[PDB]
C-alpha cells in the first residue's frame, strides 16, 4: 500500500497472510470467507513466467495478524491448506484474466475478536455498490513505495471505483469484464494504491443497506504504484461468484 495508513486493531479481521514456509517469506494477502475457505489471486500460487507454482505443501496461512513480521503470540492462528483450487480459465499467459483461487484449510478456524469472515456480494449488492465514484477499501503488507519500504503493520487505503473507459485508456494491456480498476484521477489530487506484495488481498465495501462488509475485488495487477493517470486493477469477485459457489458446494465446508 502506497499513501495508506496503519490499520486499527480488528479493522480487517478477514485479512489473511499467505506465508512461505521456506524460505519463510510473505507471499501475498488473502481473505477469510468462512472457517475453512480462503480467497486469493491465482497468480500468488501459479505464475509460470516467473517460475512460480506453489503447492498446498509449500504453504502457510496466518490469520489475525497486525504486525507483518512478529509472531503474534496469542492472537494469530496459522493453518495448513488441505487443497488449492485455481480458476480453470485463469489467463496467466496474457492479462491475469480471472486472477482468482480458493484455499481450503486443513481444519476449521475459530472466530475471535481478530478473526472474522467477510461476506461475498449477491447480484443486488454488486449492482448498487459497484459504481464509478464509490469508495472501496484495500489492505496489505506490501510495498509502501513503488521503489524507493515494508510496513511494520497492516496498511489501509480507501479508493474510488473508476469508470471502465478511463480504466481501458490508462494501459496497453487488455482489460476484461472480470476486472475493475480503482484510484484517484491526477486532477483529483488525492493519491494511493496497492503495490507489489499486496496481491490476493481484498477490495472491500461496507453496504449502506445492512452495514455489512462485502468483498468486491481481489488485488491483482498494476503498472508502477501510485503514478498519475494509472489505476490499480482488481479481480471482479461478483463476476466469478458462480465458480466460487461451485467449488465450495463440490468439495467443502
Amino acid at each position: 500500500i502506497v499513501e495508506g495508513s496503519d490499520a486499527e486493531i480488528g479493522m480487517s479481521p478477514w485479512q489473511v497472510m499467505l506465508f512461505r514456509k521456506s524460505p519463510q517469506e510473505l507471499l501475498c494477502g488473502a481473505s477469510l470467507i468462512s472457517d475453512r475457505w480462503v480467497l486469493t489471486a491465482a497468480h500468488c500460487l501459479l505464475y509460470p513466467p516467473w517460475d512460480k507454482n506453489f503447492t498446498e505443501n509449500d504453504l502457510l496461512v496466518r490469520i489475525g495478524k497486525h504486525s507483518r513480521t512478529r509472531y503474534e503470540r496469542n492472537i494469530e492462528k496459522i493453518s495448513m491448506l488441505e487443497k488449492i483450487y485455481i480458476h480453470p480459465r485463469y489467463n496467466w499467459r496474457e492479462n491475469l484474466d480471472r486472477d482468482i483461487a480458493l484455499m481450503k484449510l486443513k481444519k476449521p478456524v475459530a472466530f475471535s475478536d481478530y478473526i472474522h469472515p467477510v461476506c461475498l456480494p449477491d447480484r443486488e449488492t454488486a449492482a448498487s455498490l459497484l459504481q464509478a465514484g464509490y469508495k472501496g477499501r484495500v489492505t496489505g503488507w506490501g510495498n509502501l513505495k513503488e521503489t524507493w519500504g515494508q510496513p511494520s503493520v497492516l496498511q489501509v487505503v480507501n479508493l474510488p471505483i473508476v469508470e471502465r473507459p478511463v480504466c481501458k485508456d490508462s494501459t496497453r494491456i487488455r482489460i476484461t469484464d472480470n476486472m475493475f480498476c480503482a484510484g484517484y484521477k491526477p486532477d483529483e489530487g488525492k493519491r494511493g494504491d496497492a503495490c507489489e506484495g499486496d496481491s490476493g488481498g481484498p477490495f472491500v465495501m461496507k453496504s449502506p443497506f445492512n452495514n455489512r462488509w462485502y468483498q468486491m475485488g481481489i488485488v491483482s495487477w498494476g503498472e508502477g504504484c501510485d503514478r498519475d493517470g494509472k489505476y490499480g486493477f482488481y479481480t471482479h469477485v461478483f463476476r466469478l461468484k458462480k465458480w466460487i459457489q461451485k467449488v465450495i458446494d463440490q468439495f467443502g465446508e
Binding site: 479493522m11 470467507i33 472474522h116 467477510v118 469508495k135 461496507k206 443497506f209 455489512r212
Partner: protein, 33 residues
C-alpha cells in the same frame, strides 16, 4: 453472499463502534443509510 455473521466486525459493528475512515466510504455511496 458470504458466511452468515459475515462482515460484522467484533470490535466495530458488533459494539456499534465505527473505524476512523469508514465514514468516507459511506459518504461516497452518496452518503449511506
Amino acid at each position: 453472499s458470504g458466511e452468515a455473521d459475515c462482515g460484522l466486525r467484533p470490535l466495530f459493528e458488533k459494539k456499534s463502534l465505527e473505524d476512523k475512515t469508514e465514514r468516507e466510504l459511506l459518504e461516497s455511496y452518496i452518503d449511506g443509510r
